[PDB]
């Protein structure tokens, strides 16, 4: 495991990273255009915007585009958060 | 330490205490490691450098460091130079933003659409590129040689804006269509993109590294030859430099992407070609040899480049294990006639493939490429059509429609190339302030000779002398220099030769008679000196001798190959004498850039220190800075951006400063720059 | 009195039959017989591409006796080379500009026409030392205007696809932009 994607946002998602980071793991992290100023955005290693034209909150729902995202990205693992897609079984 | 705090000499320097903690102390580590690199304190140096080090160490890491632990490891004080990429943009954008560009008007910044991205309709094919690696450099002539088409090689990221926009064209622009060339357009022979100006042009105006460009467009071109122009003795450069220099530069630029090398001389003199073509071959890469056209061979009373002159070079150059003979016309002096009994009488003296090169500047181009193309030749070079005309190449999607229904076609995707051309379209307006204005047909480039460069800089110096209003006497006399040196064949740098003269000439009131009566008591400019003294090489027909002893005078004349007498020049020792100049081990590549340009290369190095990698903004941006409530988005890797927002210039101080502020992605940041008016 | 052909599609095009080279043949014939001195093809497009040229004044010389003038556009980059396939063919007389007014939209340039022909079978019938220096004065005047100017212009091969002459589209892009379709004329010129 090298990298890793967090699909979420904000405080919990700026958590992971630290806790990545601490056991050397390069971050990458997705953004709404809604949410361009979010700190996560900026507190990863590299970030991707997704949902485009969707409702920001649906763009975090977005299944595809997220793995879209991991896999473009080269990332060998996402943590989900919690709240949006953590308890979602699909 | 918070934003906006001046911090003052008086007090100690302690910013702020992080602690860490853990049940593990290996993970008290992990989090302090964490944090320091976490930290974004800009606005004064700090010391986490030096504590990020200290908790990487296994002394520390072990907990066993002792008080002299940090003294007795050297290891500690070796930081990596900090890239802080948000700060130096700013400074770029607030430099421009209030003092404007240099050497272009402060205009204020237009609104400008995405430019238009192309509707392609792809078709795989190998390509020449495909051929040369996969099976050599003799099989793509082949390749050539079994092709029925006219070949086309586009210009139009080389000398198209070399002719039309002064070279300024731009990597960032470079890169937003080079994907498509090489997908849309697979039928080219190459694409010319390096060599000519670009080399210094890049570093010197556009803050951008040649082998930057280099690199970033070969991985986006995988399939596409690249080609540069190459002068045999001096590669890209004007100094004299030894042969292991060239041959140096050509290992390099061989590996770093170059496919062919079109070599030439500015005297079509075969001795300053002959090593570089061979260093061509040996690193596996096909070499065009050059004969630079000049004169007119149907003017019978310009006999000394008549048809002859032209096949015997031929046949010397294809001796020279050249792989592909290359016609470079550089002023556009190929009418179309002589370019049907030129190409027709080359064909017959050699069989390596032909590839042409002409300038549209007396609206003869097409119809020379046509006539050409009925006598046979293989390549042809041209532009996009929006970089095309004048003193450009002839337009390569006008050469498919004007070859269509012809005994031979033109090979290329014109539907893709026309979609392409406007992406050049309107990208070139961009580059508005470079523009050389309006630009018609001219055939007094028969008479004068002067290439379209050489005609753009005497054009300046006569101005920069208040001999602007008299220009039409100075292009008389750089058609009576020229005859007076013996016609010479006029390019880079043998083209400023005459120019220099000419201008000499008018200034100080002198006809030909006056320099013959009272040469001596003047001092000719120092490349007239130069050529005369053979730094050049040797004139085709040699020199005029009266003339030469009066503008030689005392001067040590040499008869053979300059670079023979070139000062002996040490890679280890050059190396080692520039890292300690720019502060890191440079590779081969800007060893090779610092002696081909020292001062322009250090220069370079600068403004890299000042404004970082300027070569990321957009054209308008980077030349015209913001606008008040402007918003932008600068990619600098693969997921990492800088939105940067402006919102107020502040009035200047006293000293001459201003405060602009901006958000550099959610932050404010106040920045201070020099108002220099 | 030259009666007057306007040309357009393109002859070598099968799928445009409608304009072929029949139809130019026949409308000749008609006007030969009208009594006019001389027959003319106003390329008003610069559609015609230079073999084009060649095939459609060599079948119109078959056809009448009467001198052929023609005009073109150097629109497309093409002008001056359909003017050498239509002079091959023996086309009698040509339309052409002084340098410094022609190009793009414009004629081709009558000095370049010139040299074109130099040393061909055919020679254009003009002093041309005089022309270039007659293009001196030409050159300077067009500077006053400048107001006027259309821009930077450059070959354009897109007026094959759309056959708009170069009035018709300095015209469309200002009716586009008045009515705020501007940024669209690409599908203005689509449509
Ligand atoms: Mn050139
Ligand atoms: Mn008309």
Redesign the interface.
């Given at each position: 495991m090298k990298k890793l994607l967090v699909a979420n946002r904000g405080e919990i998602a700026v958590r992971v990273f630290?806790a990545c980071?601490?056991?050397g793991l390069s971050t990458?992290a997705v953004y709404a255009r809604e949410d361009?100023?979010?700190?996560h955005?900026?507190?990863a290693?590299?970030?991707?915007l997704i949902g485009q034209g969707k409702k920001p909150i649906d763009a975090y729902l977005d299944i595809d585009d997220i793995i879209r995202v991991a896999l473009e990205?080269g990332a060998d693992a996402i943590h989900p958060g919690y709240g949006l897609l953590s308890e979602n079984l699909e | 330490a918070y934003a906006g705090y001046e911090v003052t000499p008086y007090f100690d320097s302690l910013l702020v205490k992080v602690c860490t903690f853990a049940n593990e102390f290996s993970?008290s580590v992990?989090?302090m490691?964490?944090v320091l690199?976490?930290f974004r304190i800009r606005g004064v140096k700090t010391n986490i450098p030096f504590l990020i080090n200290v908790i990487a160490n296994e002394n520390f890491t072990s907990g066993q460091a002792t008080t002299t632990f940090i003294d007795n490891t050297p290891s500690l004080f070796n930081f990596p130079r900090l890239r802080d990429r948000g700060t130096k943009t700013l400074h770029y954008l607030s430099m421009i933003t209030v003092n404007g560009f240099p050497g272009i008007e402060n205009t204020e910044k237009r609104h400008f659409e995405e430019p238009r991205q192309p509707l392609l309709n792809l078709e795989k094919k190998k390509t020449a590129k495909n051929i040369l690696d996969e099976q050599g450099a003799d099989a793509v002539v082949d390749y050539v040689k079994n092709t029925k088409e006219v070949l086309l090689t586009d210009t139009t990221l080389r000398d198209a804006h070399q002719s039309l926009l002064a070279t300024r064209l731009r990597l960032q622009d470079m890169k937003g269509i080079a994907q498509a060339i090489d997908q849309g357009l697979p039928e080219l022979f190459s694409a010319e993109m390096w060599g000519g100006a670009t080399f210094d042009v890049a570093y010197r105006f556009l803050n951008e590294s040649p082998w930057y460009r280099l690199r970033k467009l070969r991985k986006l071109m995988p399939n596409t030859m690249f080609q540069m122009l190459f002068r045999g003795s001096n590669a890209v450069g004007y100094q004299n430099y030894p042969d292991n220099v060239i041959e140096e530069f050509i290992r390099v630029a061989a590996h770093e992407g170059i496919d062919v090398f079109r070599i030439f001389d500015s005297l079509n003199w075969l001795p300053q070609m002959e090593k570089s073509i061979q260093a061509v071959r040996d690193n596996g890469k096909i070499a065009e040899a050059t004969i630079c056209y000049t004169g007119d061979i149907l003017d019978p009373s310009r006999p000394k480049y008549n048809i002859q002159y032209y096949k015997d070079l031929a046949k010397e150059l294809e001796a020279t294990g050249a792989h592909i003979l290359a016609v470079k016309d550089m002023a556009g002096l190929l009418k179309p006639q002589a370019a049907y009994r030129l190409i027709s009488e080359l064909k017959d003296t050699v069989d390596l493939p032909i590839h042409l090169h002409t300038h549209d500047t007396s609206g003869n181009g097409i119809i020379t490429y046509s006539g050409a193309t009925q006598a046979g030749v293989d390549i042809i070079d041209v532009a996009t059509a929006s970089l095309a005309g004048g003193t450009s190449q002839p337009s390569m999607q006008s050469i498919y429609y004007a070859l269509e229904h012809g005994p031979r076609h033109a090979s290329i995707n014109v539907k893709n190339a026309e979609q392409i051309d406007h992406y050049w379209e309107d990208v070139r307006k961009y580059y508005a302030p470079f523009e050389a204005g309006i630009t018609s047909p001219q055939t007094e480039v028969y008479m004068h000779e002067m290439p379209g460069g050489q005609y753009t800089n005497l054009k300046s110096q006569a101005a920069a002398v208040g001999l602007g209003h008299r220009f039409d006497e100075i292009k008389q006399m750089y058609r009576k220099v020229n005859m007076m040196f013996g016609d010479i064949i006029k390019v880079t740098p043998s083209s400023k030769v005459v120019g220099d003269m000419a201008l000499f000439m008018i200034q100080n009131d002198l006809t030909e008679e006056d320099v013959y009566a009272r040469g001596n008591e003047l001092n000719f400019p120092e490349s007239v000196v130069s050529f005369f003294r053979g730094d050049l090489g040797q004139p085709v027909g040699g020199f005029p001798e009266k003339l030469q002893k009066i503008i030689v005078k005392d001067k040590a004349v040499i008869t053979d190959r300059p670079g023979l007498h070139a000062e002996k020049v040490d890679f280890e020792t050059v190396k080692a004498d520039l890292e300690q100049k720019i502060g890191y081990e440079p590779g081969d590549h800007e060893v090779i850039s610092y002696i081909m340009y020292p001062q322009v290369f250090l220069d370079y190095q600068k403004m890299q220190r000042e404004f970082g990698a300027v070569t990321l903004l957009d054209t308008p941006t980077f030349l015209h800075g913001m606008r008040l409530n402007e918003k932008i988005e600068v990619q600098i890797?693969?997921?990492?951006?800088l939105?940067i927002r402006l919102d107020e210039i502040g009035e200047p101080d006293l000293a001459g400063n201003r405060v602009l502020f901006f958000n550099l992605?959610?932050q404010r940041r106040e920045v201070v720059i020099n108002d220099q008016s």
């Open positions: 630290r980071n601490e056991l990458v361009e100023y979010s700190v955005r900026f507190k290693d590299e970030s991707y990205s | 993970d992990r989090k490691d964490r690199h976490e890797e693969k997921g990492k951006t939105s992605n959610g």
